[PDB]
Design a protein around this ligand. Structure first.
Ligand SMILES: Nc1nc2c(ncn2[C@@H]2O[C@H](COP(=O)(O)OP(=O)(O)OP(=O)(O)O)[C@@H](O)[C@H]2O)c(=O)[nH]1
Ligand SMILES: [Mg+2]
Lengths: 73, 431, 184
């Protein structure tokens, strides 16, 4: 999740694609009633766009996967 | 006037040269009769490079046709643009070679080399300022493999202050089922490593895989590959026939692109890849064409440059575009802060813009690079070379003519040394 | 074109050939030469060294290359100006000790190739004497079933009722003329 919002948009896109591939590979990570919303959110999100627009979406995924929101000064 | 003499060897070489001349004649504006009919002044400012001036404003093509078999000679002469060629440059034999390097280099190949030199010597005497030569052939048969290297060494000696560039064709088992082919190919490489300034490797396996996947062809014939070969050759020789901001010739290009004399194998490319059909999809933009010409899918060789290190890169654009847009693109893409940043595209790229677009395409980009990925092809060839030298199969065919067994071991050692040098030079940084 | 084309044209016009004759029995070669020339002693007996003679038979310019030794014969097999078209080897029937060397020389000389090659003619002189081998024994000893690209033929001869030798010599000429030259 920390790499999902990197300074380079290509790194963000690569991390998003790799996370999507790993979620499609392993099925014992996220539950059945949670993985659907995660896949729907990860697919309908342009990670190569305004960081303010993208960030809001990443905080969402964290809250959907039980992860504390990392913040900076 | 920096004139360049062109030589054609073998059936493949003759066909490729004929198609290249056919392509460049329609671009320069020359009718089958021999006169000029273009509507631009930029089509004649460099016509003295590949043509000669005659009486009545004629432009004779500067190419020589040589073979040990006449079938190809008759096929071309009677072609659409065969009447413009000089009949004195037709030197052919009868028997041939039969896929044997010895029969084409020491036996029947040496009984015609002197006759070939006659035409060359005589053609180079009328040139006011000769720059170099050129040769198009293939590394599969016996004629273009043995007689080709022989003529190359002849030019190297008689003329050691000139330039030598070849457009070899790498054979593939998916097309030809010949068995000794690999040996002949090695014997040619053993001489091309030492007596060549620049080489453009055109892998037939890569073209077959492209025609059998991207273009989707049930049975890709020879013309389907020859079209792409001629298109790539017309895309590369644009700086030598049309001026621009990147003022260079053959000597400057060989100095800038070839830093080491032993490392000079390039990998060409062209985008977009179209078949022989007279159709078109949509006018692609500059970034799309750049991404297509820089991708490993549009590579003429079966080698991935992503696994290697780029040495010298040079791209040539053709279309109604401006240099400012190309500069802005090359400056924006190489920025990691942008969203359209890519890693599979190098940074040191020499850009060039041409006004005249290719025949049938409004915008097209040509890729020329010196990636260290030819070691994969050299290992694929060495695999076949070692999988047949252990059993000594078909080795008596060469020794029964006058060849020595030490030549094969010397060629294998040279190939191994070249592969090791490429592997050593692949890892290089500068901080 | 060149010197090779002119040489081939001259060979096809004058019908010139080159028959490399080998052997060491120094007894079976006389009749062979007598078949090439009406003479009986002059240019009929084999020489110890190496002699080149030219005779005319059936309108064919035969260039017999009589070699006495039977070692390192690859020097006479090939030539920068002319190749070998026929090969005639004369051995002894009642001699099983000097046959292995001849078999090894024939195996090292004749090799496999793409198209056809020279024609072989194995001669077996002195068959009426006790101890002579038949055609099957000679074929099994020399191992002629593994020799391809060269048509071979065993022709027997004897001092008495030797079944002559006309077909053995006629087949060689019929196979040579129908290979390089054209019938019509
Ligand atoms: N791309 C391409 N390859 C060709 C073409 N014609 C032949 N080849 C390839 O060239 C190799 C055979 O070499 P040839 O052109 O037949 O050589 P040659 O020197 O004329 O032949 P010989 O004198 O018989 O030895 C094989 O790998 C063929 O697939 C052609 O038009 N295009
Ligand atoms: Mg050929």
């Amino acid at each position: 999740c920390l790499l999902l919002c990197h300074r380079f948009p290509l790194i963000r896109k690569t991390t998003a694609s790799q996370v999507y591939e790993t979620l499609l590979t392993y099925s014992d990570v996220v539950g059945a009633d949670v993985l659907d919303e995660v896949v729907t959110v990860l697919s309908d999100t342009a990670w190569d766009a305004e960081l303010a627009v993208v960030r809001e979406q990443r905080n969402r995924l964290c809250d959907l996967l039980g992860v504390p929101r990392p913040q900076l000064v | 006037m920096r004139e360049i003499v062109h030589i054609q060897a073998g059936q493949c070489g003759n066909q490729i040269g004929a198609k290249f001349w056919e392509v460049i004649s329609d671009e320069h504006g020359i009718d089958p009769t021999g006169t000029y009919h273009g509507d631009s002044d930029l089509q004649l400012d460099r016509i003295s490079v590949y043509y000669n001036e005659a009486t009545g404003g004629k432009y004779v093509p500067r190419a020589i046709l040589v073979d040990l078999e006449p079938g190809t000679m008759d096929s071309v002469r009677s072609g659409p643009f065969g009447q413009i060629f000089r009949p004195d440059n037709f030197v052919f034999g009868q028997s041939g070679a039969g896929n044997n390097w010895a029969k084409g280099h020491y036996t029947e190949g040496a009984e015609l080399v002197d006759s070939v030199l006659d035409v060359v010597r005589k053609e180079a005497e009328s040139c006011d300022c000769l720059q170099g030569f050129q040769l198009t052939h293939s590394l599969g048969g016996g004629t273009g493999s043995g007689m080709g290297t022989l003529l190359i060494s002849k030019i190297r000696e008689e003329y050691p202050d000139r330039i030598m560039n070849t457009f070899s064709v790498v054979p593939s088992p998916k097309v030809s089922d010949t068995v000794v082919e690999p040996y002949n190919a090695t014997l040619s490489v053993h001489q091309l490593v030492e007596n060549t300034d620049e080489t453009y490797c055109i892998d037939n396996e890569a073209l077959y895989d492209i025609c059998f996947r991207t273009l989707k062809l049930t049975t890709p014939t020879y013309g389907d590959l020859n079209h792409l070969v001629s298109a790539t050759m017309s895309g590369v020789t644009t700086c030598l026939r049309f001026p621009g901001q990147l003022n260079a010739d053959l000597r400057k290009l060989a100095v800038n692109m070839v830093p080491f004399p032993r490392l000079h194998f390039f990998m060409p490319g062209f985008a977009p890849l179209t078949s022989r059909g007279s159709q078109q999809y949509r006018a692609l933009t500059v970034p799309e064409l750049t991404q297509q010409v820089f991708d490993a899918k549009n590579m003429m060789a079966a080698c991935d440059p992503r696994h290697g290190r780029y040495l010298t890169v040079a791209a040539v654009f053709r279309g109604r575009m401006s240099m400012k847009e190309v500069d802005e693109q090359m400056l924006n893409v190489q920025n990691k802060n942008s969203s359209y940043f890519v890693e599979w595209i190098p940074n040191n790229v020499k850009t060039a813009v041409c006004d005249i677009p290719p025949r049938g395409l409004k915008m097209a980009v040509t890729f020329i690079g010196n990636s260290t990925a030819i070691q994969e092809l050299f290992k694929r060839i060495s695999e076949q070379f070692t999988a047949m030298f252990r059993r000594k199969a078909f080795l008596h065919w060469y020794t029964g003519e006058g060849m020595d067994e030490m030549e094969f071991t010397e060629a294998e050692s040279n190939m191994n040394d070249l592969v090791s040098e490429y592997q050593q030079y692949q890892d290089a940084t500068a901080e | 074109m060149g010197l090779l084309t002119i040489l081939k044209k001259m060979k096809q016009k004058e019908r010139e050939l080159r028959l490399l004759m080998l052997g060491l029995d120094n007894a079976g070669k006389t009749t062979i030469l007598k078949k090439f020339n009406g003479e009986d002693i002059d240019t009929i007996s084999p020489t110890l060294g190496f002699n080149i003679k030219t005779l005319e038979h059936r309108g064919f310019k035969l260039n017999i290359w009589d070699v006495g030794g039977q070692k390192s014969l690859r020097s006479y097999w090939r030539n920068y100006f002319e190749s070998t078209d026929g090969l005639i080897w004369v051995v002894d029937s009642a001699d099983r000790q000097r046959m292995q060397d001849c078999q090894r020389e024939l195996q090292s000389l004749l090799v496999e190739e793409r198209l056809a090659g020279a024609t072989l003619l194995i001669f077996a002189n002195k068959q009426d004497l006790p101890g002579a081998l038949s055609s099957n024994a000679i074929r099994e000893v020399l191992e002629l079933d593994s020799i391809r690209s060269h048509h071979w033929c065993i022709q027997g001869c004897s001092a008495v009722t030797g079944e002559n030798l006309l077909p053995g010599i006629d087949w060689l000429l019929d196979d040579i003329s129908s290979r390089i030259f054209t019938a019509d």
